[PDB]
Design a protein around this ligand. Structure first.
Ligand SMILES: NC(=O)c1ccc[n+]([C@@H]2O[C@H](COP(=O)([O-])OP(=O)(O)OC[C@H]3O[C@@H](n4cnc5c(N)ncnc54)[C@H](OP(=O)(O)O)[C@@H]3O)[C@@H](O)[C@H]2O)c1
Ligand SMILES: NC(=O)c1ccc[n+]([C@@H]2O[C@H](COP(=O)([O-])OP(=O)(O)OC[C@H]3O[C@@H](n4cnc5c(N)ncnc54)[C@H](OP(=O)(O)O)[C@@H]3O)[C@@H](O)[C@H]2O)c1
Ligand SMILES: CCc1nc(N)nc(N)c1C#C[C@H](C)c1cc(-c2ccc(C(N)=O)cc2)ccc1Cl
Ligand SMILES: CCc1nc(N)nc(N)c1C#C[C@H](C)c1cc(-c2ccc(C(N)=O)cc2)ccc1Cl
Lengths: 157, 156
């Protein structure tokens, strides 16, 4: 099973401010919707609660508590290793879609990264990890918008 | 100026049947939307008439006749050479978005290709060109849908 990771980060590394993503970049949500369409997503419990079970995707959520989802489109796991093992029975591909914690915990498992960098430097208390040099950019495209953004695909060599 | 090209082709190479794309692969249009957002596109006159002048894009359209367009976001050019030369003054990047004829005439100038292959072999009279071996795939992702599709990005 292949693990991808999709994230949007501000120029200063911020990805979150409390339970909110602290920018609104017109156009960027299209990439996220387009690349995740009918995909399996792996998210942390907090991210899942902020985003919800959006239509046309399937969800693996991890929690350390007895927390549960209300939805036969979501599988809840007690660990990332269990989620990975369970997902590999259902699909050959999962896209890690966030939580700062989940990103830190799964970045060494990822073999391709979908990284949108937003031309803004907001306040926030949740950050994206530094991208290790195990990965290289293989595609990049710039977008002008109300807030500009740059989409890069990174591959593990 | 950078030239990209983006297309959806069936597994038998068909991209069109008359004025129509001969399939509906639910979700694939999202890729096209995402990659063309606030971009300049280059299209042939027939493809432009088949498509809306959809929002948040600017359209260079080529024709050999007297055809013209109302929409403020469209510039009409008499040839590909003139479109390319005039686009270079207007933008840093154009995405060639089709016409079989337009794809044939512009594939040699593209440096990256966005290619969605649709899990179908329909009837049609317009085909995508042979991709030269100067291009290689740098990214690939499969999608399951009513008709499955595979998204590949090629770099020259
Ligand atoms: N810009 C972006 O790309 C993007 C994307 C997504 C989210 N965000 C932002 O990121 C922030 C949320 O990130 P976060 O780090 O606070 O939370 P998170 O990663 O979304 O979720 C953390 C929770 O997941 C569970 N968890 C984490 N690791 C686990 C493990 N190894 N085993 C079992 N359960 C595990 C725990 O759930 P329990 O507490 O239930 O035990 C933990 O509290 C928000 O601000 C959101 O807006 C940004
Ligand atoms: N699946 C996909 O990725 C996709 C994408 C787009 C379109 N399509 C399909 O492709 C089909 C249309 O393709 P097509 O090849 O018939 O038409 P097209 O390439 O879209 O347009 C051809 C027209 O463009 C103009 N043109 C072409 N070369 C020119 C040049 N060098 N200088 C000036 N004008 C030039 C001419 O317009 P005039 O006739 O006005 O002189 C020509 O008739 C449709 O079926 C459509 O559904 C598929
Ligand atoms: C578009 C942001 C983004 N970009 C890239 N590149 N990668 C990413 N991971 C994310 C993300 C995210 C989290 C998961 C999220 C998403 C949503 C949400 C809800 C509805 C829509 C929609 N427009 O329908 C879009 C997004 C809400 C809360 C959160 Cl927390
Ligand atoms: C989306 C298919 C596609 N995929 C990839 N990968 N590359 C491409 N070039 C195209 C294309 C195309 C032509 C230009 C086209 C587009 C549209 C159209 C229809 C609906 C919407 C929408 N859903 O709002 C947006 C665009 C209609 C007719 C045509 Cl003839």
């Amino acid at each position: 099973m292949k693990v991808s990771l999709m994230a949007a980060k501000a120029k200063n590394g911020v990805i979150g401010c409390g339970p909110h993503i602290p920018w609104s970049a017109k156009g960027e949500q299209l990439l996220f919707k387009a690349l995740t369409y009918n995909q399996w997503l792996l998210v942390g419990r907090k991210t899942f609660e902020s985003m919800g079970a959006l239509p046309n995707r399937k969800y693996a959520v991890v929690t350390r508590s007895a927390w549960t989802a209300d939805n036969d489109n979501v599988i809840v796991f007690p660990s990332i290793e269990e989620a990975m093992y369970g997902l590999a029975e259902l699909t050959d591909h999962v896209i890690v879609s966030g939580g700062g914690e989940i990103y830190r915990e799964t970045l060494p498992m990822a073999s391709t990264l979908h990284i949108s960098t937003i031309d803004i430097e907001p306040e926030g208390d949740v950050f994206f990890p530094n991208i290790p040099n195990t990965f290289e950019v293989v595609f990049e495209q710039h977008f002008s918008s109300n807030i500009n953004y740059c989409y890069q695909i990174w591959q593990k060599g």
